[PDB]
């Protein structure tokens, strides 16, 4: 129940808008009006921070309340640059593609990939603030012009003769950065990567990619399954002949070797840290999201509150 005391912070509630932009803006406006002491507004989904800023502008309150968000909507980055948004937490699709190619090429060459018993490798979020937002935009520019960073540093891997496949779940812009990551790793390691995108986002399209990769005898496959419960068989058939890993979305019931993805819970803890840096003295916090029935909204808000409360992480590391 709300309000909830989290250390020196009071989470007043989680306001839902069902992705209606004008309702998201209204929620921000009524929050400012009914809670004159509110200190930070937090947008849990990509659109919420732009509508928080819209509500602050209508209330003449830009800069009077701190703002923290998720993702890199252009209005969110503009707000970071003009200091009305303290920072935002973004995913790293480029590292999804790059590391998938890196780890599949390493296994194809006999090397080992350290994977925990959970079978999950967490690709780190990125925290963007006013202090590093120009470094972020420069990184994105470099990536788009085909000169993205070599995440593997000095580590040499001879991937010539290795052929791997990288299967997305759609033609979303998220996959354009991952595609650049695949091609940068392939150039770095000398391997060949087939980036395969299901144009209409159906499992039947992914099934034909999987069967083509088996017929081509690829050395490894990374896939973001569209409907994991109903793709266990087709993934297992590929696993019989070649290593399959999951990326971005997981099929934990299948024979896939491991999963790499984002931890929305740890992304929430990172946003909790941005809140703490935006208002070190504490105060009232309001969260905003489309709906709370979605898993990533539950994980992001729970991570925020656990971080503000200083909740100790029951963790395994070895
Ligand atoms: Ca600036």
Q: How far does residue 270's CA lie from ligand 1's centre (Å)?
A: 22
Query: Within 13 A of 250's CA, how many CA atoms are on the CB side?
Result: 14
Q: Which of 215, 214, 4, 129 is nearest to 223 (CA)?
A: 214
Q: How far does residue 76's CA lie from ligand 1's centre (Å)?
A: 13
Helix (H/G/I), strand (E/B), else coil: 175: helix
Q: How far does residue 85's CA lie from ligand 1's centre (Å)?
A: 10
User: Which two structure tokens, joined as six digits, stand for 131?
Assistant: 């202090």
81 is in an annotated binding site: yes
Q: Which domains does the chain have, with CATH numbers?
A: 4-91+263-308 (3.90.190), 93-123+153-261 (3.40.50.2300)
Q: How far does residue 190's CA lie from ligand 1's centre (Å)?
A: 40
Rounded CA separation 189/160 (Å): 7
Q: How far does residue 240's CA lie from ligand 1's centre (Å)?
A: 53
* Angle, alpha carbons 139-157-262 (nearest 5°): 45
Q: How far is CA 56 from the centre of its chain?
A: 27
Q: How far does residue 64's CA lie from ligand 1's centre (Å)?
A: 17
Q: How many CB atoms lie within 10 A of CB 294?
A: 14
Phi-psi map region of 90: left, alpha, beta (phi>0 left; psi -120 to 50 alpha): beta
Resolution in A: 2.1
Give the chain's largest Cα–Cα span.
65
Q: How far does residue 82's CA lie from ligand 1's centre (Å)?
A: 5
**Cα dihedral across residues 137, 267, 69, 40: positive or negative:** negative
Q: How far does residue 56's CA lie from ligand 1's centre (Å)?
A: 19
Rounded CA separation 24/42 (Å): 12
Q: How many CB atoms lie within 10 A of CB 92?
A: 19
Q: How far does residue 132's CA lie from ligand 1's centre (Å)?
A: 10
Rounded CA separation 216/261 (Å): 27
């Amino acid at each position: 129940g709300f309000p909830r005391q989290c250390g020196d912070y009071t989470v007043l509630g989680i306001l839902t808008d069902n992705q209606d932009n004008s309702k998201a803006k209204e929620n921000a406006e009524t929050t400012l009006l009914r809670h004159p002491n509110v200190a930070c507004l937090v947008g849990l989904w990509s659109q919420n921070t732009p509508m928080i800023l819209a509500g602050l502008r209508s209330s003449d309150a830009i800069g009077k309340v701190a703002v923290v968000g998720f993702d890199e909507h252009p209005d969110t980055l503009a707000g970071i640059r003009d200091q009305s948004v303290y920072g935002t937490i973004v995913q790293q699709p480029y590292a999804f593609g790059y590391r998938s190619v890196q780890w599949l090429t390493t296994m194809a060459k006999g090397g080992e990939v350290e994977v925990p018993e959970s079978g999950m490798i967490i690709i780190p979020h990125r925290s963007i603030t006013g202090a590093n937002v120009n470094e972020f935009a420069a990184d994105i520019d470099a990536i788009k012009s085909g000169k993205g960073p070599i995440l593997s540093g000095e580590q040499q891997i001879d991937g010539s003769g290795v052929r791997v496949a990288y299967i997305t779940n759609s033609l979303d812009p998220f996959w354009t950065l991952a595609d650049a990551g695949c091609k940068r790793a392939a150039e770095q390691f000398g391997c060949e990567v087939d980036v395969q995108m299901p144009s209409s986002g159906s499992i039947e399209e992914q099934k034909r990619f999987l069967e083509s990769n088996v017929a081509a005898k690829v050395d490894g496959i990374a896939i973001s399954p569209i409907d994991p419960e109903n793709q266990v068989a087709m993934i297992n058939d590929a696993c019989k002949v070649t290593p399959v890993i999951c990326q971005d979305s997981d099929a934990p019931a299948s024979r896939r070797k491991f999963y790499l993805g984002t931890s929305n819970y740890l992304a929430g803890r990172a946003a909790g840290k941005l809140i703490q840096e935006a208002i070190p003295e504490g105060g009232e916090v309001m969260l905003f999201v489309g709906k709370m029935e979605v898993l990533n909204a539950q994980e992001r808000s729970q991570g925020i509150m656990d971080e503000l409360a200083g909740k100790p992480i029951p963790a395994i590391l070895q």
